[PDB]
Amino acid sequence: RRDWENPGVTQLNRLAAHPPFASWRNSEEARTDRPSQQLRSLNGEWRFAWFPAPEAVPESWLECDLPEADTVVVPSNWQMHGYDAPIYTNVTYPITVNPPFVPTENPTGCYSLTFNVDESWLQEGQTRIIFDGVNSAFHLWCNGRWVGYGQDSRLPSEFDLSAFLRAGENRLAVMVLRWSDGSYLEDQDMWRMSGIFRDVSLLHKPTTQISDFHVATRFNDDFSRAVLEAEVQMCGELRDYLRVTVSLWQGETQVASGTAPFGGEIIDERGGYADRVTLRLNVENPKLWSAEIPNLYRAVVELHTADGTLIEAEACDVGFREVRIENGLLLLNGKPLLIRGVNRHEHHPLHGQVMDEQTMVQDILLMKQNNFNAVRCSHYPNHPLWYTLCDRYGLYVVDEANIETHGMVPMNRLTDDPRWLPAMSERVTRMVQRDRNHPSVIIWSLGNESGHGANHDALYRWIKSVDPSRPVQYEGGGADTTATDIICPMYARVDEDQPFPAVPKWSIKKWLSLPGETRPLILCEYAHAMGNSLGGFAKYWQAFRQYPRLQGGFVWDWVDQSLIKYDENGNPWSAYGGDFGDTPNDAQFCMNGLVFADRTPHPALTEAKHQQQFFQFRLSGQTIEVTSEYLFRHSDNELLHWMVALDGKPLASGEVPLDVAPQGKQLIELPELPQPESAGQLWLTVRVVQPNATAWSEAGHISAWQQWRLAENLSVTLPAASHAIPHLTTSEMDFCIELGNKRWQFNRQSGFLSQMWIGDKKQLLTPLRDQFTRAPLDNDIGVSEATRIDPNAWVERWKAAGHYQAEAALLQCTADTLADAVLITTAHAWQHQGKTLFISRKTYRIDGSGQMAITVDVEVASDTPHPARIGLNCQLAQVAERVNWLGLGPQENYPDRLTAACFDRWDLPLSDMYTPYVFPSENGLRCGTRELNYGPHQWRGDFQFNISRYSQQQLMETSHRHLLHAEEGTWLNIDGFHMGIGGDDSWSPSVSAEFQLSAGRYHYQLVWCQK
Amino acid sequence: AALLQCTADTLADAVLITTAHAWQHQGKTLFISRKTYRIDGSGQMAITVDVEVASDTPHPARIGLNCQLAQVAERVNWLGLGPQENYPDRLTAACFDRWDLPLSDMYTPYVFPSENGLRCGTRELNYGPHQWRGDFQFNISRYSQQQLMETSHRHLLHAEEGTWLNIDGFHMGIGGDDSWSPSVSAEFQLSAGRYHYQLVWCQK
Ligand SMILES: [Mg+2]
Ligand SMILES: [Mg+2]
Ligand code: NA
Ligand code: NA
Ligand code: NA
Ligand code: NA
Ligand code: NA
Ligand code: NA
């Protein structure tokens, strides 16, 4: 029948979808969500054999275990065990586009498991098996007998095993197909794996059972009163003595309880559902649920007899919250939301796509600690535990159907095809039937990148029909089609329009007011965090706050999809597309996260935390205006800590308790501040600290911060008169300056400071020369390849202009002696094939104080691509342990991504000045620095810089970070100016005009001396 | 202007004059100006200017130099934005080219006198025997900033001796969204803290 090549057959003998069941036989246990004897786990060691195609599987395998098979762990992806290679492809399907057919060489995983079943389970009731996740299709045999078939890799497939099992030992045989017609609906930008990668369990239910139940909560005008409505459905034999009791608990305190026999109200001319019943419970002053305060209640559903005998119990956590769109705004419990969200794939560096509680909790904590309050299930229903955690920890979830047909041409070829409506409907309907009781889920999504087809409109309507409690969104077809209640574009920019044909990406501000538009706009994806990114992040947030209908978005995305491989000596390294022999592939585009695969933060995470703060501040005189962006909670676990410092020197600090109501304000006046001892700039820094621990944070957690320049006192006092005078020594080849223990050497042919001495030690490995380029960032590269060059990408424009091959032509080099110093003057012209790209004019003034003032003035041809930077560099001879500086820090920061950094005195080990992006590039920069100290060297001025053991050349020539090798000495890069990193997207120039080096003529000055 | 430094150095083919001033008021240093004047054997005077503006003082109306030339010519020839008066936040209509106008046209007769006649993006200015080169903004007329500031009606203005010249490295926006509250957009307020600009003065 080749059921895996027919979208008309997505399952065989599969049981209906429903909310999480456990069939407790004790109510108290259901109330506490404790383990159930009726819900067993079959996770653990299984038998597994790999085959190249289903036709290669031996018939003996159904009856008897294969001796060639290995014992492996389940759940898991067999690619992670190395049976075959995992594939990373973005848009292009991993298989030939020829729906509904798949390759004949279809990797087949044969899993089997011998397990016990107690006679008590077979003597009464129904025993079903549940597969939470099987990629991508599979057939099922129990004791040699065929049971059923299933598709859709991201939702549970359940079958009734009652007629197949026997008391004692039993053997399951599961044949998993890597590819199937269902693969055409699973073209998400991520690794292509397969296997039984989610929990497998055994559930026993009484013959007469609770087959389904829906929990709803509607409120009155001010939410002071609510009604919990619970529709319960049963299967089995109807009897008058049967009853359904639904009780609601708030902790240990029972809040309400209701009981009733089956028999619903009249529905139509044929009557009503005799097998259903709706219980309604009133609740006064309910504790509302929100990401701010995740108050949860427990709903216990009991199926029993009128005499009081319990037959079975189910239950769920209930969160009293209302989600509705009104007058253009998405409201939660009547208040307009501000989505601080992120897209999150289920990815583990070692386990692939198998999730575990530990990892889920770790992601959630990091998210809430960094001011995220929402997550989007990109792009499929998640592991069931994920919704439980979000309910409890408090995160707004967008539940997304497992539907993506990005590779099709056009994108909606399948979604507009009625013969694919069935397969699509199951992926949407079975998702709703499974998660509709989770309060964390506030929005349903019809899928991702599948264009806009009629099937979308149909399913969009189906949801609005079955579940009115949640809005429905979908981005395909233009982000604003008839299949979405929310304008949810991906990578739409703040002010810049991208008028693509048929599916343009308008600036979000303009989008809201297009003629006739009135819906709220929340980007389903924005701020592509690939590599050194998130430049311009602060621009979205400024907009979200000013525009009521710009209600935020979900950053793309949470964690890099890098995998772990081992080298020749067992050393692990982060691998990406193509590193497994997988081809065609999309290399590093699988790494777009705010954190590395191991959950170690990327520098951009801190920018997100800052911009996403819940407290806004304003300064006026000595009064700080604190404004809360919370919608429901008072600042009951926050205190404001202020600190005034002069050029890094702490001059005064204090603490004030924060007592601000949601959306309210608090005025805090600072004490009379004492005038600073010397000259310099006074800086004010405030921080919001949570004194007490929470479920998601430790005591002392900093949730927000801000800075302001206070009084500045310009130094107007001339330094002491030098004692000695620098001596100049002109020679055919050099201009040497001597001053005590110091020696400066300027090569007259190159016109560069080729060397410096402090006593007997040389200070340079490579001369100090100008630099106008940088090792290409992922955003500089885009989709350009050696095979497919993108002339539009920044990297290509620089290469094409000769920026990386520019050779300096010495125009002038003269030496002059002053009354108290030696003045060296140079002028270089960088040219490429007769084109003068840049002209550098400098003057070095070495005085008796032993200081070398470097004054630089650059000219950049208006018709050459704006340069990546304008500074100097050199390979210092020394290698120190610490790096001390006065500027923006402590973490890496760039022009368009430095709002999170603060100005102060920072001190870090040299290694922290290097950001280990898997794909190497220019990194570690720190802007707005007035003083830098390394070893015996000190540079002063107003510049940005990066210092490490890796030269820009090595960084741009190396593909993986583990292949880098510390160079001799330390490479220093001091820039007077540096281009922005961009990041609105990573496949087209995204550096905003204000952050491009286009002034034409640049000036900057540095002073080098001993610390 | 409090003088902090004024030195002279004889070079291989020129004389270098270095100065440093600090403008104060009530013991507060508003701005600091550092310059060097380089005069070579060609008779050209290269002026390098680097200013510091206290971050806590209101952003200055402009950053440049001014003086009253003894000269009084009839024409003003320049290579920059023109031919009409243009300011940083109102120069889109101006075009870059070689303009040549009568001195009076370098003056805008606003009934209520104020700073006027400026021209931006100028790389070369020619007046009488003088020529200034660089990348500056400028206005030139027979009325001083002081007279314009103290005179209520344009008909009460009297032509001063010689010609008043204002060469700006940077000039604040004029604004206009309204005329009863600060309206100069942030990007047009001189708030960088440190400014640099250079000029070359010569004859012919
Ligand atoms: Mg099928
Ligand atoms: Mg895609
Ligand atoms: Na697990
Ligand atoms: Na908003
Ligand atoms: Na990607
Ligand atoms: Na508090
Ligand atoms: Na590279
Ligand atoms: Na006046």
Residue A991 and residue A896 in contact, taking contact as beta carbons nearer than 8 Å:
yes
CATH classification at residue B44: 2.70.98.10
CA gap A866, A977 in Å, rounded: 12
Q: Which residues contact A821 (CB under 8 A, 6 or more apart)?
A: A725, A726, A845, A846, A847, A848
Distance of CA A855 to the CA centre of its chain: 43
Residue A196 and residue A176 in contact, taking contact as beta carbons nearer than 8 Å:
yes
Q: Facing residues of A640 across strands?
A: A656, A688
3-state secondary structure of A374: strand
Nearest residue to A643 (alpha-carbon basis) of A909, A819, A868, A905: A905
Work out the number of other CB atoms within 10 angstroms of the CB of residue A739: 21
Residue A482's alpha-carbon distances to A327, A413, A453, A510, A767, in angstroms, are 18, 18, 10, 19, 63
**From the CA of A491, how far away is ligand 7's center (Å)?**
25
Residue A41's alpha-carbon distances to A44, A296, A751, in angstroms, are 9, 27, 74
CA gap A97, A913 in Å, rounded: 46
Q: For residues A7 and A82, state if they share a domain.
A: yes
CA gap A836, A827 in Å, rounded: 13
- Tell me whether residue A400 is exposed, middle or buried, using C-beta atoms within 10 angstroms of its C-beta: 0 to 12, 13 to 18, 19 or more: buried
Residue A154 and residue A188 in contact, taking contact as beta carbons nearer than 8 Å:
no
Q: Is B54 in contact with A713 (Cβ distance < 8 A)?
A: yes
Q: Is B9 in contact with A819 (Cβ distance < 8 A)?
A: yes
Residue A349's alpha-carbon distances to A565, A574, A591, in angstroms, are 9, 8, 12
Angle A454-466/A421-435 helices, nearest 10 degrees? 30
Q: Is the peptide bond before A410 cis (omega within 30 degrees of 0)?
A: yes
Read off the DSSP letter of residue A448.
S
CA gap A971, A317 in Å, rounded: 56
One-letter identity of residue A305: T
Q: Is the peptide bond before B102 cis (omega within 30 degrees of 0)?
A: no
Pairing between strand A761-762 and A753-758? antiparallel
Residue B111 and residue B154 in contact, taking contact as beta carbons nearer than 8 Å:
yes
DSSP for A728-739, please give it: EEE-SSEEEEEE
Read off the DSSP letter of residue B90.
B
CATH classification at residue A551: 3.20.20.80
CA gap A467, A986 in Å, rounded: 37
Candidate list A186, A400, A404, A449, residue with the active-site label: A449
CA gap A246, A217 in Å, rounded: 14
CATH classification at residue A260: 2.60.40.10
Read off the DSSP letter of residue A931.
E
Q: Is B22 in contact with A681 (Cβ distance < 8 A)?
A: no
Q: Which residues contact A570 (CB under 8 A, 6 or more apart)?
A: none
Q: Residue with structure tokens 């009325």?
A: B143
CA gap A174, A188 in Å, rounded: 25
Work out the number of other CB atoms within 10 angstroms of the CB of residue B103: 16
CA contacts within 13 A on the Cβ side of B15: 5
Backbone CA torsion sign across A63, A67, A68, A70: positive
Angle A603-611/A537-546 helices, nearest 10 degrees? 10
**Domain span at residue A651?**
613-718
- CA nearest A711 in B: which residue? B56
Confirm whether A449 is a catalytic residue.
Answer: yes
Q: For residues A540 and A598, state if they share a domain.
A: yes
3-state secondary structure of A766: strand
Instruction: Decide which of A321, A353, A368 is a domain's last residue.
Output: A321
Read off the DSSP letter of residue A662.
T
Work out the number of other CB atoms within 10 angstroms of the CB of residue A218: 14
Helix (H) or strand (E) holding B149: helix B145-150
Read off the DSSP letter of residue A643.
E
> Residues preceding discontinuities in chain B at C–N > 2.5 Å?
none
Candidate list A5, A475, A525, A892, residue with the active-site label: A525
Q: For residues A24 and A78, state if they share a domain.
A: yes
One-letter identity of residue A631: L
Work out the number of other CB atoms within 10 angstroms of the CB of residue A215: 25
Backbone CA torsion sign across A472, A476, A481, A486: positive
CA gap A618, A967 in Å, rounded: 46
Q: Looking at the CA of A12, name the nearest ligand.
A: 1
One-letter identity of residue A213: F
Report the greatest alpha carbon distance in chain B.
Answer: 56
Residue A396 and residue A292 in contact, taking contact as beta carbons nearer than 8 Å:
no
Nearest residue to A433 (alpha-carbon basis) of A750, A133, A214: A214
CA gap A779, A604 in Å, rounded: 14
For chain B, what is the domain count? Answer: 1
Q: Which residues of A touch B32 (CB under 8 A)?
A: 714, 716
Strand ranges inside A178-333, DSSP E: 190-192, 195-196, 200-205, 209-219, 225-235, 242-250, 253-260, 276-284, 297-305, 310-318, 323-326, 329-332
Q: Looking at the CA of A343, name the nearest ligand.
A: 5
CATH classification at residue A168: 2.60.120.260
- Tell me whether residue A59 is exposed, middle or buried, using C-beta atoms within 10 angstroms of its C-beta: 0 to 12, 13 to 18, 19 or more: exposed
Nearest residue to A54 (alpha-carbon basis) of A90, A105, A123, A14: A105
CA gap A843, B158 in Å, rounded: 46
**From the CA of A917, how far away is ligand 7's center (Å)?**
10
Q: For residues A665 and A708, state if they share a domain.
A: yes
Copy the structure tokens of residue A75: 């759940």
- CA nearest B31 in A: which residue? A714
Residue B52 and residue B60 in contact, taking contact as beta carbons nearer than 8 Å:
no
Work out the number of other CB atoms within 10 angstroms of the CB of residue A292: 17
Residue A779's alpha-carbon distances to A533, A641, A800, A951, in angstroms, are 7, 37, 17, 20
Phi, psi for residue A799 in degrees, rounded to 5: -60, -50
Q: Is the peptide bond before A439 cis (omega within 30 degrees of 0)?
A: no
Q: For residues A239 and A255, state if they share a domain.
A: yes
Q: For residues A792 and A703, state if they share a domain.
A: no
Q: For residues A3 and A113, state if they share a domain.
A: yes
CA gap B77, A284 in Å, rounded: 83
Among partner residues B29, B50, B135, which is closest to A716 by beta-carbon distance? Answer: B29
Q: Angle at CA A402, nearest 5°, toward A399 and A405?
A: 130
Pairing between strand A550-555 and A521-526? parallel
Q: Residue with structure tokens 């929340």?
A: A522
Among partner residues B7, B11, B32, which is closest to A716 by beta-carbon distance? Answer: B32
Torsion angle, alpha carbons of B128, B130, B133, B136, to 10: -70
Q: For residues A110 and A142, state if they share a domain.
A: yes
- CA nearest B49 in A: which residue? A1003
Nearest residue to B50 (alpha-carbon basis) of B195, B198, B191, B200: B195
Nearest residue to B187 (alpha-carbon basis) of B61, B88, B79: B88
One-letter identity of residue A824: I
- CA nearest A715 in B: which residue? B29
Residue A871's alpha-carbon distances to A482, A755, A801, A906, A973, in angstroms, are 52, 18, 19, 22, 7
Among partner residues B4, B24, B135, which is closest to A1001 by beta-carbon distance? Answer: B135
Backbone CA torsion sign across A868, A869, A870, A871: negative
Residue A734's alpha-carbon distances to A744, A748, A754, A815, A824, in angstroms, are 10, 5, 9, 10, 11
Q: Which residues of B touch A681 (CB under 8 A)?
A: 55
Q: Which residues contact B83 (CB under 8 A, 6 or more apart)?
A: B99, B101, B105
Number of H helices, E strands in chain A: 13, 58
CA gap A169, A287 in Å, rounded: 49
CA gap A262, A275 in Å, rounded: 6
Q: For residues A342 and A430, state if they share a domain.
A: yes
CA gap A119, A162 in Å, rounded: 11
CA contacts within 13 A on the Cβ side of B5: 18
CA gap A32, A29 in Å, rounded: 5
Work out the number of other CB atoms within 10 angstroms of the CB of residue A970: 24
Confirm whether A314 is a catalytic residue.
Answer: no
Instruction: Decide which of A206, A228, A253 is a domain's last residue.
Output: A206
Q: Which alpha helices (DSSP H) does A733-811 contain, by range?
A: 778-781, 794-801
Nearest residue to A202 (alpha-carbon basis) of A105, A115, A322, A319: A115
Q: Is A714 in contact with B2 (Cβ distance < 8 A)?
A: no
Phi, psi for residue A197 in degrees, rounded to 5: -100, 10
Q: For residues A296 and A327, state if they share a domain.
A: no
CA gap A656, A669 in Å, rounded: 10
Size of interface A-B (CB pairs under 8 A): 37
Backbone CA torsion sign across A114, A116, A122, A128: negative
- Min Cα distance B90 → chain A (Å) is 19
Copy the structure tokens of residue A680: 């310099």
Read off the DSSP letter of residue A333.
T
Q: Is A714 in contact with B52 (Cβ distance < 8 A)?
A: yes
Among partner residues A716, A814, A823, which is closest to B4 by beta-carbon distance? Answer: A716
Helix (H) or strand (E) holding A424: helix A421-435
Among partner residues B11, B32, B194, which is closest to A942 by beta-carbon distance? Answer: B194
> How was this one solved?
X-ray
Strand ranges inside A392-460, DSSP E: 396-400, 441-445
Q: Facing residues of A192 across strands?
A: A87
Backbone CA torsion sign across A950, A955, A958, A963: positive
Please enumerate, as own/partner, the contacts of A405-408 that have beta carbons within 8 Å and a separation of 24 or more: A405/A184, A405/A185, A405/A187, A405/A449, A405/A450, A405/A451, A406/A91, A406/A187, A406/A188, A406/A189, A406/A448, A406/A449, A406/A450, A407/A91, A407/A92, A407/A93, A407/A97, A407/A187, A408/A97, A408/A184, A408/A187, A408/A450, A408/A451
**From the CA of A271, how far away is ligand 7's center (Å)?**
70
Terminal alpha carbon distance of chain B? 32
Resolution of this entry, Å: 2.5
Instruction: Decide which of A321, A352, A386 is a domain's last residue.
Output: A321
Q: Angle at CA A397, nearest 5°, toward A395 and A403?
A: 155
Terminal alpha carbon distance of chain A? 80
Read off the DSSP letter of residue B187.
G
Residue A624 and residue A618 in contact, taking contact as beta carbons nearer than 8 Å:
yes
Q: For residues A376 and A514, state if they share a domain.
A: yes
CA gap A878, A762 in Å, rounded: 9
Exposure string over A927-940, b if 16+ CB within 10 A, otherwise e: bbbbbbbbbebbbb
Q: Residue with structure tokens 């009104």?
A: A326
Q: Looking at the CA of A661, name the nearest ligand.
A: 6
Q: Looking at the CA of A351, name the nearest ligand.
A: 3
Q: Residue with structure tokens 């999170």?
A: A900
Q: Which residues contact A806 (CB under 8 A, 6 or more apart)?
A: A772, A830, A831, A832, A837, A838
Report the greatest alpha carbon distance in chain A.
Answer: 113
Q: Residue with structure tokens 């240990």?
A: A252
Q: Is B29 in contact with A714 (Cβ distance < 8 A)?
A: yes
